[PDB]
Design a binder for this molecule. Structure first.
Ligand SMILES: CCCCCCCCCCCCCCCCC[C@H](O)OC[C@@H](COP(=O)([O-])OCC[N+](C)(C)C)O[C@@H](O)CCCCCCCCCCCCCCC
Ligand SMILES: CC(C)CCC[C@@H](C)[C@H]1CC[C@H]2[C@@H]3CC=C4C[C@@H](OC(=O)CCC(=O)O)CC[C@]4(C)[C@H]3CC[C@]12C
Ligand SMILES: CC(C)CCC[C@@H](C)[C@H]1CC[C@H]2[C@@H]3CC=C4C[C@@H](OC(=O)CCC(=O)O)CC[C@]4(C)[C@H]3CC[C@]12C
Ligand SMILES: *C(=O)CC[C@H](NC(=O)CCCCCCCCCCCCCCC)C(=O)O
Ligand SMILES: CCCCCCCCCCCCCCCC(=O)O
Ligand SMILES: CCCCCCCCCCCCCCCC(=O)O
Ligand SMILES: CCCCCCCCCCCCCCCC(=O)O
Ligand SMILES: CCCCCCCCCCCCCCCC(=O)O
Ligand SMILES: CCCCCCCCCCCCCCCC(=O)O
Ligand SMILES: CCCCCCCCCCCCCCCC(=O)O
Ligand SMILES: CCCCCCCCCCCCCCCC(=O)O
Ligand SMILES: CCCCCCCCCCCCCCCC(=O)O
Ligand SMILES: *[C@@H]1O[C@H](CO)[C@@H](O)[C@H](O)[C@H]1NC(C)=O
Ligand SMILES: *[C@@H]1O[C@H](CO)[C@@H](O)[C@H](O)[C@H]1NC(C)=O
Ligand SMILES: *[C@@H]1O[C@H](CO)[C@@H](O)[C@H](O)[C@H]1NC(C)=O
Lengths: 55, 339, 128, 117, 228, 369, 37
């Protein structure tokens, strides 16, 4: 329909006028988050069997 | 003509977005994480096996206490488990046995469910008389309920096969906001940690980012080749992972507005049914149709572990809020807790 | 992004010939079974022909058997439909439809009103 | 062979058997284990008495000399022992048919009541 | 008082497993069926002869409980919600004997789906009375939509009702062979197809589903013992 | 040999005891006089009849199963041997075929030891697979576990009987009650083994033929038929054995009292034969409705029958009688003993090891580990 | 004599008991000819 194609154009304009950052900046933020929380990850850092609630 | 003029303007805007996305692609997440130390081999063991369901399990959700969990099976039952003791706390019989999703309220006072009945049902768990009874039935979807997630005790977001998503007011039972734009069956949704945004995955090979208060689609993500079956937010809220029937998992970033990483392998030719992150976001756990669950290194796209305890299709998996354990549901009627 | 763009099409005399081409992009073309569907004026979508991943298995609808020929070139990511001895019954918008999932013998919902993995369609009119 | 000569050669070992029976307990004459070797030697004794005259042991008439001492010396003893014989058909047939009948009835009961629940 | 809560939790768990044992008896005894049809196929009349996203119909045949489900307010895209019915006893596929070519393509997708590979299909070739009137008249020939019909011969294993003429028998058995060619091409013993020439108002349809379901359960038991 | 002279001498004392106690011959017609030959005692017999008596146990080569024959002349005198003109009783059959029977029984002995040993090994592993892997659990497997247990227990008791009681000759002569107690448990577990074959046949017939829709049955009737009912014919036999035919260790097979147990067992196996015929009839009907080729129908019908024979014990029904012909009897012994002592191994192989559901489950859990 | 298939093991045991579980070739067998009884 015409009203469907016109709405798709109005949505593509809202998504084209957004401020994007570099992939290098975004990738470094995800890596920096994992390092700051690596100790608090029981699946990454195996918790001792003494304090494991599923022993 | 105007149809050919509105279509040609769409190709111009799509080319403009594709060039804006290519300008920001200065490096790859593989190149920036090429020097970090891999996680080695993640060998988790089955700590608990929850039995009691009669038919295939379609969904499960952990409670905010990291101890209780709700599970939905197509026999018409909602079972709330105490994963520490494997005891059953509640067994809720459903009106419609074709349930496809379930949710646990953050307060722990309510559970939700829905499916081919096109209705999201809310069950109060802290009633005075002590019998779990339906508190509200949210009607309005013209397709099967695929996913539902509580914002609070009075708000919930639903996704349905009618290609739409909706935000509900549980007390009144009305749709406060309807999220439209998908051209396929919306299969999964994931709330952001601040619950102000949520991402949806549909059968149009596309993912969309929605604003809860404003009710608009902010970003549309592409890259998958087939139907997206699962979606999960990164712990920080600036990224999300998707699992599709093209046998691949893809990581998308919100601020970069494009895909960062593909988690695939030549020997994997089955679709992904569920995805979840670890507490730190380093591990991306994915459930597959080949009865297996693969533990992916989210930063390096390396296979770090395999969970091979189920005898049928793995339909759902979930990580606790404290990251202590992973629960996996499958079509073999069993829930397994892994550590 | 999955993109299917149908080329060819146009006015042709009854008994003439046409060749339609479907330029595919955004997916591994060799892993998916391809289809041809059409929508005649004032009618619903109708499946016409399909071809397997390799091209060995080929099926046609009854009304076009012996006249239409489907073929795929996985190197160029293109789907072809050779239409010979065209009749005025063949006047329709021809869509290039892809099966939803790869490595699947079943092909669901290619003739649905709203289907994502289908092109915009090319117009083929057979009149004198 | 010799009939007349052999019969007078018999009383020698016969009365010889009548003295070994005297030293052993007279009241325990019935239990064969009391004189198992002496009763045996009497038999091997009677064995060759017939052989010397050329008669083949046992002989239809030398049996009467063994029966003759078995009449006066072994008559106060029980003739009963382990019989080891099957019961008559009036008892044997019901003992077999009834458990066979109950077997067929027990199998049909399982076919009937297992699905009945 | 931690022992008082752990004993109250084990008591509640024992009362739940007692109710789950009763629910297992009802669930394992009921046989679930999925009723699928096409455009103007006649399935609604069969249900009538015994908002909402799915409709349920419960009936008994020889004290056996049956639970037939019919899809209501769902879009024409089936590749997602049809996976919910991978454990039903049988799929009742109603076809109105080009809507026929569309039903053949839908039957192929159901038969070759990876999750429905162990599910049998009870095929109801419906509207057999309307097929007779069209063939007897002769206005529109099936050869124009099925060129192999001109080379088709009625099989020797056919059982035509002595009332109908060979033109109707040849037409209705050709349509059945179209569906059987799909079923015999991928039938490795996991599931079978049970075709029936049905009318929407027939009283034999319920008995047909009962007899086919007994055959399916029989073949399932024979497969467990590896006899068949 | 000294013990042989022992049993020979008391037989002579019992014979002269018998000729004295027996009343005079009643029939006035000519008769052969009551006589004691060197080995056996013969009562008065009419003319023209050849008496039959069981062979003595005085020598190692003598088989008590065989018969001793003595002929009475119509004139009224006993049979005279032609070579020496001597009153002679025929003891030829006693040791004529003993060395060849002893050679064959040597093979059957170790065939039983190895068959039951291999059966225990495979069935314990098979029982351990069904116990450990909970996913395989169902009503069919529950009955299989009980069926496997009867085979294991029956095999253990048979090995104990063959290893302990059979070689120990001094034990049989002492005849302790522990010998008759082991025999009772041997007969009970033997009867439980056959009746659990019937339980498998009844359950399979109910699944396929009678109650197809029913998915859960009350297994209490199978437990009662398999474990409880065998106590009835075993007790009746034990009571009649301790009253009428009470031999050392109850080892005798000549008594017809054995049919109190083997009668019901044969009846249970004949019922299984009619279950198999009906099951094969249903299976053949299934392959005809799907229009299967006649060649493949025969191969699939023989295969289904061959895997059901060791489960239902059909080999006891088709070959229920040992032939009197000696060369056919030798073939019968090797065939039946092989099928009897290796039946537990066949059942464990067909229904656990070659079971596709067991293979896929074990391969998965092993791959995870 | 039972002579039934289910009596096969019992018949084998009964035979070996009387043979004293002997399997060796016996010394010259017992004479059962004219010279004996
Ligand atoms: C994985 C395996 C599965 C197996 C399943 C079951 C398969 C069938 C098993 C039986 C197959 C053979 C049946 C026929 C046997 C014929 C024996 C033949 O006539 O004589 C062989 C006999 C010696 O004869 P002889 O010299 O005259 O005696 C002279 C003796 N005198 C010295 C005392 C005088 O036996 C000897 O060869 C070996 C004796 C010791 C072993 C006896 C057999 C034990 C079982 C063997 C098979 C076990 C199963 C397979 C292996 C695991
Ligand atoms: C030589 C003599 C003295 C041996 C006697 C042994 C019996 C006392 C044993 C041996 C086999 C036992 C049976 C083996 C299996 C079962 C089934 C069991 O019920 C089940 O269903 C258990 C397995 C399951 O859960 O599937 C109940 C006990 C019972 C009858 C057992 C009862 C006790 C039995 C008869
Ligand atoms: C002395 C020697 C010869 C052994 C004799 C054993 C019998 C005296 C007893 C011992 C164990 C008993 C069994 C123990 C338990 C059961 C299970 C019982 O069934 C159930 O418990 C029902 C289970 C269900 O269907 O849910 C039926 C009787 C049975 C077989 C009993 C039958 C009689 C048995 C074999
Ligand atoms: C006459 O003298 C014969 C006596 C003696 N024969 C024997 O000693 C026979 C040996 C007994 C065999 C027992 C083996 C049983 C093994 C079962 C193991 C299964 C366990 C399950 C898995 C762990 C002779 O002199 O020949
Ligand atoms: C499979 C189990 C078999 C058990 C067989 C047990 C055989 C021995 C039983 C002995 C009972 C007591 C006998 C001696 C009695 C006494 O003199 O005091
Ligand atoms: C657990 C069951 C054990 C059964 C054991 C049965 C043993 C029977 C022993 C019989 C001894 C002789 C009895 C009769 C004695 C007589 O009257 O001469
Ligand atoms: C386990 C016990 C089963 C039932 C009893 C079985 C037989 C045991 C006793 C056997 C010898 C009986 C001797 C006396 C017979 C009689 O009462 O006349
Ligand atoms: C289930 C139907 C009835 C089955 C009947 C089975 C009978 C078996 C008989 C076995 C042999 C009995 C003794 C025969 C020798 C004899 O006594 O002369
Ligand atoms: C040594 C093992 C021998 C086993 C012999 C088994 C014989 C089985 C006979 C089955 C006959 C089945 C007849 C089916 C007739 C039909 O339905 O057409
Ligand atoms: C019905 C199947 C076998 C059951 C009967 C067992 C007997 C073997 C088969 C027939 C031969 C039996 C001969 C019995 C001897 C007789 O009665 O004199
Ligand atoms: C259910 C009954 C099955 C019967 C199967 C046939 C059994 C025949 C038994 C008698 C003939 C074979 C044995 C002959 C022995 C002999 O002649 O000495
Ligand atoms: C697969 C199970 C087989 C059961 C029967 C095995 C024994 C029979 C075949 C081999 C022996 C054949 C007869 C040999 C006779 C002879 O020694 O002359
Ligand atoms: C038995 O032997 C006695 C011995 O004196 C003889 O008198 C009698 O006639 C015999 N009876 C017979 C041979 O029937
Ligand atoms: C036995 O008697 C017959 C009949 O008088 C006689 O001919 C024969 O010679 C006797 N036997 C011997 C060995 O002399
Ligand atoms: C003794 O018996 C055997 C077989 O039983 C027979 O061959 C033989 O002829 C018999 N001897 C006499 C003297 O009858």
């Amino acid at each position: 329909s015409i009203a469907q194609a016109r709405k798709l154009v109005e949505q593509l304009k809202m998504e084209a006028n957004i401020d994007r950052i570099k992939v290098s900046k975004a990738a470094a933020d995800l890596m920096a988050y994992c390092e700051a929380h690596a100790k608090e990850d029981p699946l990454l850092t195996p918790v001792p069997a003494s304090e494991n609630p599923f022993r | 003509s105007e149809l050919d003029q509105l279509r040609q303007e769409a190709e111009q805007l799509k080319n403009q977005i594709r060039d804006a996305r290519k300008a920001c692609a200065d490096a790859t997440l593989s190149q920036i994480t090429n020097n970090i130390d891999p996680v080695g081999r993640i060998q988790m063991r089955t700590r608990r096996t929850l039995r009691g369901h009669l038919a295939k399990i379609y969904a499960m959700h952990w409670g905010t206490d990291s101890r209780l969990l709700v599970s939905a099976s197509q026999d018409g039952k909602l079972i709330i488990w105490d994963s520490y003791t494997t005891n059953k706390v509640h067994a809720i019989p459903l009106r419609s046995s074709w349930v496809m999703t379930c949710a646990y309220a953050p307060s722990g006072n309510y559970v939700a469910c829905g499916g081919l009945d096109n209705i999201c049902s809310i069950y109060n768990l802290k009633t005075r008389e002590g019998n779990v009874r339906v508190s509200r039935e949210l009607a309005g979807h013209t397709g099967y309920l695929s996913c539902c997630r509580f914002l609070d005790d009075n708000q919930i977001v639903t996704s349905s096969g009618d290609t739409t998503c909706a935000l509900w007011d549980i007390e009144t039972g009305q749709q406060t906001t309807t999220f439209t734009g998908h051209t396929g069956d919306v299969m999964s949704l994931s709330l952001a940690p601040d619950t102000r945004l949520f991402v949806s995955g549909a059968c149009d090979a596309s993912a969309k980012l929605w604003d809860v208060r404003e009710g608009m689609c902010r970003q549309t993500f592409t890259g998958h080749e087939s139907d997206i079956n699962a979606i999960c937010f990164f712990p920080n809220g600036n990224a999300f992972a998707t699992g599709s029937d093209d046998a691949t998992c893809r990581l998308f970033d919100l601020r970069a507005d494009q895909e960062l990483m593909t988690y695939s392998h030549d020997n994997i030719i089955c679709g992904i049914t569920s995805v979840s992150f670890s507490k730190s976001g380093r591990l991306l756990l994915a459930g597959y149709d080949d009865f297996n669950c693969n533990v992916w290194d989210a930063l390096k796209a390396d296979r770090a572990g395999v969970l091979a305890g189920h005898d049928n299709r793995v339909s759902c998996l979930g990580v606790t809020d404290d990251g202590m354990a992973v629960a996996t549901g499958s079509w073999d009627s069993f829930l397994k807790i892994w550590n | 992004q999955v993109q299917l763009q149908e080329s060819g099409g146009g006015l042709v005399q009854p008994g003439g010939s046409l060749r339609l081409s479907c330029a595919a992009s955004g997916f591994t073309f060799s892993n998916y079974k391809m289809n041809w569907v059409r929508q005649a004026p004032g009618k619903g979508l109708e499946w016409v022909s399909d071809i397997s991943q390799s091209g060995a298995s080929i099926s046609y609808t009854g009304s076009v058997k012996g006249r239409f020929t489907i073929s795929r070139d996985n190197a160029k990511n293109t789907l072809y439909l050779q239409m010979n001895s065209l009749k005025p019954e063949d006047t329709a918008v021809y869509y290039c439809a892809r099966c939803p999932a790869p490595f699947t013998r079943d092909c669901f919902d290619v003739t649905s009103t709203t289907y994502a993995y289908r092109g915009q369609g090319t117009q083929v009119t057979v009149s004198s | 062979c010799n009939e007349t000569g052999m019969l007078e050669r018999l009383p020698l070992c016969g009365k010889a058997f009548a003295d070994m029976m005297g030293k052993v307990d007279v009241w325990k004459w019935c239990n064969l284990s009391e004189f198992i070797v002496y009763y045996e030697s009497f038999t091997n004794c009677t064995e060759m008495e017939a052989n010397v005259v050329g008669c083949y042991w046992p002989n239809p008439l030398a049996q009467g000399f063994i029966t003759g001492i078995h009449r006066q010396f072994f008559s106060n003893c029980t003739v009963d022992r382990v019989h080891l014989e099957d019961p008559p058909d009036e008892v044997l047939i019901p003992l077999i048919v009834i458990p066979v009948v109950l077997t067929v009835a027990m199998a049909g009961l399982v076919v009937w009541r297992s699905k009945r629940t | 008082d931690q022992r008082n809560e752990e004993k109250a939790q084990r008591e509640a768990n024992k009362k739940i497993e007692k109710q789950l044992q009763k629910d297992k008896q009802v669930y394992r005894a009921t046989h679930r069926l999925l009723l699928l049809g096409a455009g103007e196929s006649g399935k609604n009349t069969i249900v009538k002869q015994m908002t909402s996203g799915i409709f349920e119909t419960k009936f008994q045949v020889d004290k056996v409980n049956f639970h037939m489900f019919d899809v209501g307010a769902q879009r024409d895209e089936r590749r997602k919600w049809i996976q919910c019915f991978n454990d039903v006893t049988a799929i009742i596929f109603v076809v109105a004997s080009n809507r026929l070519q569309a039903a053949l393509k839908l039957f192929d997708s159901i038969w070759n789906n990876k999750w429905l590979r162990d599910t049998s299909v009870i095929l109801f070739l419906n509207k057999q009375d309307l097929l007779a009137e069209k063939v007897l008249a002769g206005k529109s020939k099936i050869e124009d939509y099925f060129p192999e019909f001109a080379r088709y011969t009625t099989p020797e294993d056919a059982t035509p009702e002595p009332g109908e003429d060979p033109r109707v028998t040849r037409a209705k058995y050709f349509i059945r062979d179209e569906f059987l060619r799909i079923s015999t091409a991928s039938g490795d013993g996991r599931h079978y197809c049970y075709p029936h020439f049905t009318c929407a108002v027939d009283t034999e349809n319920i008995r047909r589903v009962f007899n086919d379901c007994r055959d399916i359960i029989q073949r399932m038991h024979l497969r467990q013992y590896e006899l068949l | 040999y000294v013990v042989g002279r022992k049993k020979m001498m008391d037989a002579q004392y019992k014979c002269y005891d018998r000729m004295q106690q027996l009343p005079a011959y009643q029939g006035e017609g000519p008769y052969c006089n009551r006589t004691w030959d060197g080995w056996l005692c013969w009562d008065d017999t009419p003319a023209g009849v050849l008496s039959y008596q069981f062979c003595p146990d005085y020598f190692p080569d003598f088989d008590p199963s065989e018969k001793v024959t003595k002929y009475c002349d119509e004139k009224g005198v006993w049979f005279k041997h032609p070579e020496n003109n001597r009153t002679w009783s025929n003891y030829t059959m006693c040791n004529a075929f003993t060395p060849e029977k002893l050679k064959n029984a040597y093979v059957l002995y170790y065939l039983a030891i190895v068959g039951h040993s291999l059966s225990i090994f495979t069935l314990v592993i098979s029982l351990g697979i069904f116990v450990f892997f909970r996913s395989l659990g169902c009503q069919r497997v529950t009955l299989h576990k009980n069926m496997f247990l009867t085979y294991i227990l029956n095999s253990m008791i048979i090995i104990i009987h063959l290893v302990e009681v059979v070689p120990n000759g001094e034990l049989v002569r002492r005849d302790p009650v522990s010998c008759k107690i082991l025999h009772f448990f041997h007969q009970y577990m033997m009867a439980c083994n056959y009746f659990w074959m019937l339980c498998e046949g009844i359950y399979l017939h109910t699944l396929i033929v009678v109650a197809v829709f029913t998915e859960k049955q009350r297994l209490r009737w199978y437990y009662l038929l398999g474990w409880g009912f065998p106590l009835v014919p075993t007790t009746i036999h034990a009571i009649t054995r301790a009253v009428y035919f009470n031999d050392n260790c109850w080892l005798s097979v000549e008594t017809h009292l054995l049919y109190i147990i083997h009668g019901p067992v044969m009846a249970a196996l004949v019922v299984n034969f009619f279950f198999l015929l009906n099951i094969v009839r249903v299976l053949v009907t299934k392959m005809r409705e799907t229009h299967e080729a006649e060649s493949h129908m025969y191969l699939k019908a023989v295969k289904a029958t061959m895997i059901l024979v060791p489960l239902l014990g059909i080999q006891f029904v088709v070959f229920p009688w040992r032939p009197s012909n000696k060369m056919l009897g030798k073939i019968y012994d090797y065939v039946m003993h092989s099928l009897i002592h290796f039946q537990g191994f066949f059942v464990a192989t067909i229904y656990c090891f070659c079971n596709n559901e067991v293979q896929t489950t074990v391969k998965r859990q092993w791959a995870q580990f | 004599k039972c002579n039934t298939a289910t009596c096969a093991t019992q018949r084998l045991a009964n035979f070996l008991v009387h043979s004293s579980k002997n399997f060796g070739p016996i010394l010259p067998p017992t004479n059962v000819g004219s010279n004996t009884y």
